[PDB]
Symmetry: C3
């Protein structure tokens, strides 16, 4: 009855490049867990080297129970140092007949708890890295409508010590709250450094917060890897969409970006370690209907390269094309769709 069907493919560049074409599609006839359905959404992310600044753009469109929403954001981003990154951007959103814009500037500092060479040198592929990452943000929003004015007013009301504590249940709406802990993540109370109305009027807020993780949170544990600006030698982009309702879900992703593979040391490369948050959080919705898997993965290496290690083992190979399907691989698929994080490692070399 219930079969999840999906197909993935990755085509890698070789040489120095970490770039890969990634394609994914899935279809499964189970209800989505969204308490308002149908829900559809499309997203697209582009990143282009400006000059080491990256202009990163996002556009998101969705319809939730027939209501249309959008979000657009364009941000320039750059690292000041290995621990500190800055961004400046602007964007807007719309929900049905309402919309508003914003602009902001910010800084983020990532900090690992307690780096040690004893670890560095003994663990070939480290995974959990605990740390805390501090956000400092300045944002402005034109109060060009009564809702905005109204909302700014109520915030000012609320803005004592409870404010920055209690805001958390407001910010991580619905099931988002509960996911924080599931990820071994933590969100600090927020601190408002200032809040004012500037010349129409603009509401301007300066505030901060930090989030931490015990190692599963990839945003902290893989801070540098997740922003591979040094390989961004041409535009990258990724697009995805899903349609979902009480009968099924289907989804398509396609993109071209760097970071798909990574040096693994000793002449070898790997497909990058699977990010853990996506597994753990999708693990919260993946266990609601039993299903069988009808899945395939195709990996096409760059010319001349061969897979040196794969567990689960690929099923077939020809020249640079490798395919996985059935067996342990299908068991792994099921496992990860339900929230499992077992390693599926693929190393290759020339």
């Amino acid at each position: 009855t219930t079969t999840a069907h999906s197909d993935y493919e990755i085509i890698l560049e070789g040489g120095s490049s970490s770039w890969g074409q990634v394609k994914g599609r899935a279809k499964v006839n189970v209800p989505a867990a969204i308490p308002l359905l149908p829900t559809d959404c499309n997203i697209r992310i582009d990143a282009k080297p400006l000059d080491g600044v990256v202009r990163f753009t996002t556009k998101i469109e969705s319809v939730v129970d027939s209501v249309k929403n959008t979000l657009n954001v364009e941000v320039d981003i750059a690292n000041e140092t290995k621990d500190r990154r800055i961004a400046v951007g602007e964007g807007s959103l719309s929900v049905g007949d309402f919309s508003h814009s914003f602009s902001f500037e910010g800084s983020v500092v990532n900090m690992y708890y307690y780096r040690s060479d004893a670890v560095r040198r003994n663990i070939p592929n480290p995974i959990y890295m605990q740390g805390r990452q501090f956000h400092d943000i300045l944002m402005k929003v034109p109060l060009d409508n009564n809702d905005l004015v109204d909302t700014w007013e109520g915030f000012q009301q609320s803005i004592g010590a409870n404010f920055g504590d209690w805001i958390r249940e407001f910010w991580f709406i619905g099931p988002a709250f509960a996911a924080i802990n599931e990820g071994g993540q933590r969100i600090s109370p927020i601190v408002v450094n200032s809040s004012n109305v500037e010349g129409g009027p603009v509401g301007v807020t300066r505030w901060k917060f930090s989030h931490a993780g015990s190692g599963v949170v990839d945003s902290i544990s893989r801070w540098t890897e997740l922003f591979p600006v040094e390989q961004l030698n041409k535009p990258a982009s990724i697009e995805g969409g899903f349609r979902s309702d009480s009968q099924g879900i289907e989804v398509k992703v396609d993109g071209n970006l760097p970071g798909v593979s990574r040096d693994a040391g000793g002449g070898l490369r790997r497909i990058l370690n699977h990010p853990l948050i996506p597994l753990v959080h999708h693990g919260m919705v993946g266990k609601f209907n039993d299903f069988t898997v009808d899945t395939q993965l195709k990996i096409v290496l760059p010319k001349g390269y061969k897979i040196r290690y794969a567990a689960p083992q690929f099923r077939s190979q020809n020249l640079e094309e490798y395919r996985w399907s059935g067996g342990a691989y299908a068991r792994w698929v099921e496992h990860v769709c339900k929230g499992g994080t077992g390693q599926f490692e693929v190393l290759y070399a020339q």
Copy 2:
């Protein structure tokens, strides 16, 4: 092997009424998760308009590992305003050879975080509403036995800043603790405003606490809807019971109450949005044995009305009777029994 069999039926009143007869029965041959079994329980709730005060009564009987417990409570309840409700009641409990009574008075204030007409007007059927709800309670208990005297004494011992913090692991015993977070809920430390012995002696405590939610907690997000006193034009009641052991669980619910359907706007009505907490919390015990579903739902509309929208679609219809079974519906059943919250919406009209 493992089949959950269940049957549900709802018979609605028409016109202005939101009332419905609700019947439900389930049987499944899997062990309950209770670490003491067998466990049986029966509960009954009545609500009668006094005058806009409601007298609400609860009687609960259970046997846990052969020990008998009971609980009875009668409370008069009323809203002062849309945000503030008050109650006054009394009751008692028994556990094996021990029992004690109590009486109390209290007030509860519900507060939504940050209502906006921009939302109000754009979202036709809103679901997650974040908020915090403040309880203020005065309770008295006759210290008519040595256990009571003893317990009051130890509380007074404990009553520094830790007290109201640490009490939480005491209050949400066993797996109840962990469920708070699963629900995106939060419970504040308690504050004891006063504690005294009044003329035999009576221990009297005045204390408070608040609980919050990110929108899944229906108690906050659906504060007003959950107390449909305005439709309580005659007594309402509901009764349920379950028997459970290491081999199976069976349960029966039957009731007649208002609030089963609701105006949905535009001439339409709906069966009320499914409350989310019950799904999410039963989701914590629903994934321990695989099972197949053998389920049916029968909805009988009021004369003359027809279903205008149902997803998943009903399976058969005749005159005012509609039935769901198999297919997407059975998949939805499974989904919700495991902790899923996908919408199953049913709208009808004349």
Copy 3:
């Protein structure tokens, strides 16, 4: 396809003894959830009466993604009172080319929240007991290498109020964090009472913390039972090991120790109530692949004794040997492997 096969056996001593031989083996062809695989581990625990002091030894060996680790610890332990236990020990660990030793002394105080005879006398087999357990620790570690010196230095840096708060995401690495709450457990911020370098140099730290639980945490709720020093009339030990990878997991446990059975009152004895933490925490990894069960349990009573109550019922019996397999028992197996805590009670008598 996916079958978990396992076999358990328990051979009990009779008379006054609570001792039992426990054997367990499992094999299942699903990927482990460890994000680095393969991972293998072996552990052995011995406990010997010194004089009421127990010398307890642990040796753990593992290989994680080809890196070898070890841990050895020998501790003498004793109860001062029913609430307070003390330990003194020493040990060391190694990770690949690095190692370090340590020694410590400590005290642990367990405290139940609010004991009542009204409960004591009415509940024959109590399960959830809320409490908090305070640790006070003194530890020393020779700073005999640069990593150690380096690490001690960074800790001193970090050692304000955040320190003992934030340390938690460091300490409960990866998915360990999230498990605390799943268990209804809580870990307090740590307090450093002192930190110094003593004459090579030795880093010495005195610090404390407490952990609490709502009743599922067995360490608190079963404080005394879990250290059955009074029955330790000869050495006890237990050994276990597992091998795991992306294709399967296999595990073996074998041991001889007291505490396997317990007086149940009224001439009866029981196999001890199943500890709940192991179920709840393994529940976090047990739901990632569907499987069928191929399991058996054999219990061999002491001569002359008979099972007076078993639910689920045993399948076959002969003389003192009882066997469970299939049916409700297999359903129970599945249930507990997925995180279920339903009671499987076995009482016997002569």
